[PDB]
Amino acid sequence: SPEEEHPVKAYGWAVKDRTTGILSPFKFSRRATGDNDIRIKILYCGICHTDLTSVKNEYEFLSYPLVPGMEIVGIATEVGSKVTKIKVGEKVAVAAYLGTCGKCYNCVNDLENYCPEVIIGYGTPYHDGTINYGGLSNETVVNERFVLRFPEKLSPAGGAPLLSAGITAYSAMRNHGLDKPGIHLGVVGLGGLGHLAVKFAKAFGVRVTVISTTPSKKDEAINNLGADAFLFSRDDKQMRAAIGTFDAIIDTLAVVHPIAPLLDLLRSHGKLVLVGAPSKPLELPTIPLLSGGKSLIGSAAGNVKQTQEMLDFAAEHDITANIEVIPIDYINTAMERLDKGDIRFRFVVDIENTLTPP
Amino acid sequence: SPEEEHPVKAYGWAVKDRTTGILSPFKFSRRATGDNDIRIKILYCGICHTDLTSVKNEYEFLSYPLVPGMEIVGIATEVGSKVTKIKVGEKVAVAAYLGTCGKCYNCVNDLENYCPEVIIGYGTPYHDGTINYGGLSNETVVNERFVLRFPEKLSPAGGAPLLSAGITAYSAMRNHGLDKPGIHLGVVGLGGLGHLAVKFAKAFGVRVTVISTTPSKKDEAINNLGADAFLFSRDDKQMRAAIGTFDAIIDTLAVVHPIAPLLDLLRSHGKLVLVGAPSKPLELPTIPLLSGGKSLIGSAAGNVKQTQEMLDFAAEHDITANIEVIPIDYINTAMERLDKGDIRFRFVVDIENTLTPPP
Ligand SMILES: C/C=C1/C[N@@H+]2CCc3c([nH]c4ccccc34)[C@@](COC(C)=O)(C(=O)OC)[C@H]1CC2
Ligand SMILES: C/C=C1/C[N@@H+]2CCc3c([nH]c4ccccc34)[C@@](COC(C)=O)(C(=O)OC)[C@H]1CC2
Ligand SMILES: [Zn+2]
Ligand SMILES: [Zn+2]
């Protein structure tokens, strides 16, 4: 029994029947506080496109009942005897993964988001063999290595999507030098990840073009986010005039799309950084890749030290997501709106004020 | 008309009918020596898989009659008034491309192989609008920037495949730091490009595993080429035992193949360098790419300063291709053997002694 598997009671919303994807009230339990654990009372949980893909039953390996949500901002209500960096009552946030092997090269050099055995935010077994429950719940318990200190100046709700969308965009750009004035960057897709890529790029001084198939988004892209230009990808005239003009492109789309027009936008030796995860494979245009000497680079989240640095950057430059704050019992309707793209640009669930037991 | 479009006569072998891919004797002409040109009497021409892909009619943009061959070693018989780096009588070699726009960033910075308007070795228009004829011919004339000095100590026939296979392997490794001892390198495919990547890596001190679908190649890979290990690609125990063990993999195959097993062989942040050009599309497994923070990097030939440097390295370290020297009128059978992989590891055509004028 989920309410009997562990000693401390907990509750949230869960997809009980994977074939419908409907979340409903759900009681379970969480492990006791180990020596290095932090109990977190959850304030806000962001909703990302991976949550939606999970509720659409598109990830076979996940276990159900599924409690998704992996953009958690909360309060530490309890720390184990060996926690010293975080005091009870502090505002904290959780990384988009919950553990690593602790022994490989990535873990030992604090690049642990690339551990081959990274434990994702929910739906798979933790080190103690039990399935992980995510942020659509009242409280969570996390090993202190994966708990960040949340800056006092950052809106807890507006900053919650920095914990997976923001860090993915921030890290991709920091690791590949796309954070310096003089770089011309393309951002493909203007959803949660894309709109945060535009904000971080502006704060670095990067010149940014948004590349989109939705012309109604030109106005938000230029006026709201500060993009230097808007490229309608279906307009062959604009596409040909941008050939060879980008140093890098950050591709955030969750659907299958052609890669070669994107490679033709790159100058020689430019990088196409892939951070979205389409559920179907893409075609590798070999001659454009070879002849331009171009690179396809994958990137996922960021390591926990980079995430702390990202949060402190976001607090100093007032970088938050554009959010709609929702009650938990709206989550099923939000999923539909997220599926249609009717959100500008992030849902954030107010857990503390709107979740109650089943 | 091919014989009348330029002032100097020439001859070789050509695919006249693109739908059969059969080469036959062919008379044409080549331009006069301009001020910056070098006329080259062709001694040897290497045959690569791209020649075969061209003769299989898989590249729409080529024009016919098609004279392929782009691994040319020769003797300078004539230089334009403004040539000084090359003397008549010198052994020379030609890069696998013939010109560039001359004005873009890649051009002005001696990275000209990545010029967006690079003129390839044959089958497309030159700066004067005429179709280029490749190395399966008696002489060629090339702008001096794309002519290399060929080392005296290097075998002209064993060194001919350095001009496209060798340079592609050398540059890919020099450009991405796969030339430093301590790197564990995978070489996928043990054909012309693959076997020169192994030699170049052993000469750099790099630990090299050959990844192959042909177990019969294990003895040649370990004993003749010097590979440190041989990984049979179809053996799941072996593939699973190598997961996460490679720093980089150079993928040399000319056919479609699954990409995700190769990405699993890479450690996190590892590089998969693509130098073969399969004619059908490849599938990109994003989840492994994303999960590992891994890279797919394309690379093509090398610049001409790098090609010269590759040649002097190959002379000082005795790096040559393992070749079968063939007469030109065997080229159609060689194409068949090349299609089946029945060659260890390069055909080189002896142009000077076996090519004669048609009829
Ligand atoms: C940063 C979150 C993304 C999301 N998507 C898809 C995959 C995925 C991840 N978490 C999930 C949880 C449930 C279902 C799917 C996923 C994750 C988590 O981030 C890290 C460093 O683990 C991932 O597994 O990358 C290895 C990230 C990749 C892109
Ligand atoms: C070095 C040769 C390869 C070959 N294949 C395929 C494509 C191609 C090139 N030459 C040909 C000539 C005839 C038909 C196809 C090709 C080339 C060479 O161009 C250079 C050296 O700059 C290429 O990149 O052409 C833009 C190389 C890429 C892989
Ligand atoms: Zn690890
Ligand atoms: Zn150029």
Numbering used by the authors:
A (entry chain A): 5 to 362
B (entry chain B): 5 to 363
Provide excerpts from the study.
pmcAlcohol dehydrogenases (ADHs EC 1.1.1.1) are NAD(P)H‐dependent medium‐chain oxidoreductases found in all kingdoms of life. These enzymes typically catalyse the reversible reduction of aldehydes or ketones to the corresponding alcohol. The structural motifs of ADHs are highly conserved in all known eukaryotic examples; most notably, a zinc ion involved in catalysis, a second zinc ion involved in maintaining protein structure, and the Rossmann peptide‐fold involved in cofactor binding. ADHs have been shown to catalyse many complex biochemical transformations in plant natural product biosynthesis, suggesting that their catalytic repertoire has been expanded.
Here we report the crystal structure of dihydroprecondylocarpine acetate synthase (DPAS), an ADH that catalyses the non‐canonical 1,4‐reduction of an α,β‐unsaturated iminium moiety. We report four crystal structures of apo‐ and substrate‐bound DPAS from two phylogenetically related species. These structures reveal, surprisingly, the loss of the catalytic zinc ion from the DPAS active site, indicating that zinc is not strictly required for reduction by ADHs. Despite the presence of NADP+ in DPAS crystallisation conditions, none of the solved structures had sufficient density to model the cofactor. Although electron density for the structural zinc ion was clearly observed in all TiDPAS2 structures (the CrDPAS structure lacked electron density for this region), surprisingly, the substrate pocket lacked electron density at the expected site of the catalytic zinc. The lack of the catalytic zinc in DPAS is substantiated by the observation that two of the conserved catalytic zinc coordinating residues are mutated (His74Met and Cys168Ser). Computational estimation found TiDPAS2 had a larger substrate cavity than other structures of ADHs involved in monoterpene indole alkaloid (MIA) biosynthesis.
